Design a protein around this ligand. Structure first.
Ligand SMILES: COc1cc2cc(c1OC)O[C@@H](C)CCn1cc(nn1)C[C@H](C)COC(=O)[C@@H]1CCCCN1C(=O)[C@H]2C1CCCCC1
Length: 126
């Protein structure tokens, strides 16, 4: 299903072209602007380890963060920078762009691949 489809069909949006962060657009958003570094960004998301969720909907409010400020994993700083307002995307993320061989116990083991569906709700310049 979704993680496999991203492996098969996703665009590599890494600078290194190392397939560290693969993307599919699932719903098209509106506008020419994508967020840039410093913007306050509002999303809903559903994430899991790629082998089978943490969801913003669990907490009945959007997840907010400042883009490219190291507040989230590298793969979000990269991925969300490509998204338009109202876009839903699927990301599949190797450990290098997430929590690495160190991991982040107890939630994240060593060398974990992660999957997210992200909806970009809004963003505003600092
Ligand atoms: C490693 O720790 C966690 C990882 C993830 C979520 C974590 C978390 O405990 C801090 O908490 C949520 C349960 C509560 C909301 N939340 C998200 C963040 N801060 N508070 C942002 C986190 C500090 C870092 O998270 C991330 O960079 C990414 C992208 C942004 C959304 C959350 N992210 C995660 O990696 C989740 C993780 C997804 C896979 C399934 C396990 C949880």
């Amino acid at each position: 299903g979704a993680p496999a489809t991203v492996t098969e069909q996703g665009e590599d949006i890494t600078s290194k072209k190392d397939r560290g962060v693969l993307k599919i657009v699932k719903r098209v958003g509106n506008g020419e602007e994508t967020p840039m570094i410093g913007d306050k960004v509002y999303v809903h998301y559903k994430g899991k380890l790629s082998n089978g969720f943490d969801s913003s909907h669990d907490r009945n409010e959007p997840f907010v963060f400042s883009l490219g400020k190291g507040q989230v994993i590298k793969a979000w700083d990269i991925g969300v920078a490509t998204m338009k307002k109202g876009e839903i995307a699927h990301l599949l993320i190797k450990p290098e762009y997430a929590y690495g061989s160190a991991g982040s116990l107890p939630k994240i083991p060593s060398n974990a691949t992660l999957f997210f569906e992200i909806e970009l709700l809004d963003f505003k310049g600092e």
